Design a protein around this nucleic acid. Structure first.
Ligand SMILES: [K+]
Ligand SMILES: [K+]
Ligand SMILES: [K+]
Ligand SMILES: [K+]
Ligand SMILES: [K+]
Ligand SMILES: [K+]
Ligand SMILES: [K+]
Ligand SMILES: [K+]
Ligand SMILES: [K+]
Ligand SMILES: [K+]
Ligand SMILES: [K+]
Ligand SMILES: [K+]
Ligand SMILES: [Mg+2]
Ligand SMILES: [Mg+2]
Ligand SMILES: [Mg+2]
Ligand SMILES: [Mg+2]
Ligand SMILES: [Mg+2]
Ligand SMILES: [Mg+2]
Ligand SMILES: [Mg+2]
Ligand SMILES: [Mg+2]
Ligand SMILES: [Mg+2]
Ligand SMILES: [Mg+2]
Ligand SMILES: [Mg+2]
Ligand SMILES: [Mg+2]
Ligand SMILES: [Mg+2]
Ligand SMILES: [Mg+2]
Ligand SMILES: [Mg+2]
Ligand SMILES: [Mg+2]
Lengths: 119, 73, 101, 88
RNA sequence: GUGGGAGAGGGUGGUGGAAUUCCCGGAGUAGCGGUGAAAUGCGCAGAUACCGGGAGGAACGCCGAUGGCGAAGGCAGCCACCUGGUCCACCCGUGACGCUGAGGCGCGAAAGCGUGGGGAGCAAACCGGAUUAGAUACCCGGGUAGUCCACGCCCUAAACGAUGCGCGCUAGGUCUCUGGGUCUCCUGGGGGCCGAAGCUAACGCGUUAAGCGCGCCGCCUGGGGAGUACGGCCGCAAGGC
């Protein structure tokens, strides 16, 4: 039980499972969710719908932690990367700013067989 | 099909080699630090090819970003 | 004897004494490597693109010089030793190519 | 490497007369200059294979002029080999 | 020869950032991961996501191209040094000094061998999880060699343009790299596309010939047996010619 009202909202969207962390303006996390937290179990964790509940839940949870506005950060190319942010604009927090920051290597590590074409 | 002005005509008598004129080079980078395609820096094979190395030099003196973040996504 | 441009970026949070110190040691170095000055542009600090050495800014120099080719690598290797000097890029000088003439 | 004045001091030292620059001597003199310089660079850098090719060719070219120098005027041929110091 | 020029051509030393992985600390709660769907796996010894710090190895995003360099195999962050090839202009010097090239000698992707060194990610073998009528395999999670560096061997390939090298000749048009110029263009050297004449069994080739010629080297003579046997030669072995 503290107070924040303003902070960061990362989204770690994936072709397997979107997940949302919410942190203070310094990076230290406050509350998080994901298709896992929310009931879903198998693939279903990926669905845009899942990404919705995950986002909302995570906001709801920080609504009580005392928060009103947040800066969004996107990372990954989720099946529901977008409905993760859309759930936020329709969540009840001032989405100050939405920034994309997906990590991309400047060509370095060999990927898995399934990701070939970049040794 | 992706159109606008070329960064070239927006500038004047300028040195394509000065790794220190951050004030100009920046123009040849996107929102991300990414270096602009020829079809936008409006340069020529050789010109472009020089602006490349001249940038990457500045990128090492930390006068230019290797990469940036995309606002509004 | 070839003409080189020498860059030096170092910790921007230094008083005269420290600045004055490295500035000397740097001169004090070019002296030992057959390097002769030709002009020194000293742009103070500047807003760095990325944080070089935990810092958000840096102190810049620049040294139009001429020195024995063989001993360049030595010089560069010798300037980095300071913990304040956090960038040394030496370059072969060359004539300005000019686009949009 | 090999600069301006560096070249003359030998073309000077090897011209059959003033202004001669393509003398079969001036030529071989020059190949040797390089050839030796190149053989130093390969004394270390023994891995630089591509440079070696060039050498292998630079040598052929030198052996080729020599071969001719010795047919036409079997005297000057001796001279050259004397000055330069070739064969052994 | 002089004066210019482009370039991931080669060797050496240094250095920059992104990302993965592991370690340290903060914050943080119930899952993460993974798949067609799952499980193995990891997590209450606190993982994933998030922030700061560190270590280490490997590869260089955008630029990047239909592009450039090289004899070929091949070559891609940045800088310095060491070095090869090659193009143009000037028409200055030598005066047939040329071409090809059986042997020989050197180079030769990857995998592989020897000795040390390193080891992040990947990953043969292998250990598991699934899938199927069966499981060896494709799909998933781990993982050793190897992949990386030094030195020494190995000498093979769809080592491909499936097109040996040099030269002279035979319409154009268009795109481009790179030089010079009386710079809507001309001209020289690369790289592509259509297409004259011509060639071709057709496909197609067509001033980058697969056309018209000359020189010189390699090679071919039905398929299987078989790149096997035998003999020789090279190799530490694999195995090669
Ligand atoms: K002449
Ligand atoms: K090999
Ligand atoms: K190897
Ligand atoms: K080995
Ligand atoms: K596997
Ligand atoms: K054939
Ligand atoms: K021109
Ligand atoms: K052409
Ligand atoms: K025809
Ligand atoms: K021909
Ligand atoms: K037969
Ligand atoms: K045998
Ligand atoms: Mg999933
Ligand atoms: Mg190179
Ligand atoms: Mg931790
Ligand atoms: Mg368990
Ligand atoms: Mg407990
Ligand atoms: Mg803790
Ligand atoms: Mg380690
Ligand atoms: Mg190409
Ligand atoms: Mg070529
Ligand atoms: Mg060169
Ligand atoms: Mg005469
Ligand atoms: Mg070993
Ligand atoms: Mg693995
Ligand atoms: Mg055609
Ligand atoms: Mg037969
Ligand atoms: Mg065989």
């Amino acid at each position: 039980k503290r107070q924040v009202a303003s902070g960061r909202a990362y989204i770690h969207a994936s072709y397997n499972n979107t997940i949302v962390t919410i942190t203070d303006p310094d990076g230290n996390p406050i509350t998080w969710s994901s298709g896992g937290v929310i009931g879903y179990k198998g693939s279903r964790k990926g669905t845009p719908y899942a990404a919705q509940l995950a986002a909302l839940d995570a906001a709801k949870k920080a609504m009580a932690y005392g928060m009103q506005s947040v800066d969004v950060i996107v990372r990954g190319t989720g099946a529901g990367r977008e409905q993760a942010i859309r759930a936020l604009q329709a969540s009840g927090l001032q989405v100050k700013s939405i920034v994309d920051d997906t990590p991309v290597p400047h060509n370095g590590c060999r990927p898995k067989k399934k990701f070939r074409k970049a040794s | 099909p992706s159109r606008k002005a070329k960064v070239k005509a927006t500038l004047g008598e300028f040195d394509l080699r000065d790794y220190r004129n951050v004030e100009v080079l920046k123009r040849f980078l996107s929102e991300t630090g990414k270096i602009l395609p020829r079809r936008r820096t409006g340069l020529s094979g050789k010109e472009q090819r020089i602006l490349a190395k001249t940038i990457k030099r500045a990128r090492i003196l930390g006068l230019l970003p290797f990469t940036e973040k995309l606002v509004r996504k | 004897m070839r003409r080189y441009e020498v860059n030096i970026v170092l910790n921007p949070n230094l008083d005269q004494s420290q600045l004055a110190l490295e500035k000397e040691i740097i001169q004090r170095a070019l002296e030992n490597y057959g390097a002769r000055v030709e002009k020194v542009e000293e742009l103070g600090l500047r807003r760095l693109a990325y944080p070089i050495a935990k810092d958000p800014q840096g102190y810049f120099l620049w040294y139009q010089v001429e020195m024995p080719e063989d001993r360049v690598n030595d010089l560069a290797r010798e300037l980095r030793i300071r913990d304040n000097v956090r960038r040394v890029m030496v370059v072969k000088s060359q004539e300005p190519f000019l686009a949009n003439a | 490497p090999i600069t301006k004045e560096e070249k003359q001091k030998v073309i000077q030292e090897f011209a059959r007369f003033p202004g001669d620059t393509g003398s079969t001597e001036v030529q071989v003199a020059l190949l040797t200059l390089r050839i030796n310089r190149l053989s130093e660079h390969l004394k270390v850098h023994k891995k630089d294979h591509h440079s070696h090719r060039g050498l292998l060719m630079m040598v052929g070219q030198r052996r080729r002029l020599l071969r001719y120098l010795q047919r036409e005027d079997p005297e000057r041929y001796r001279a050259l080999i004397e000055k330069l110091g070739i064969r052994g």
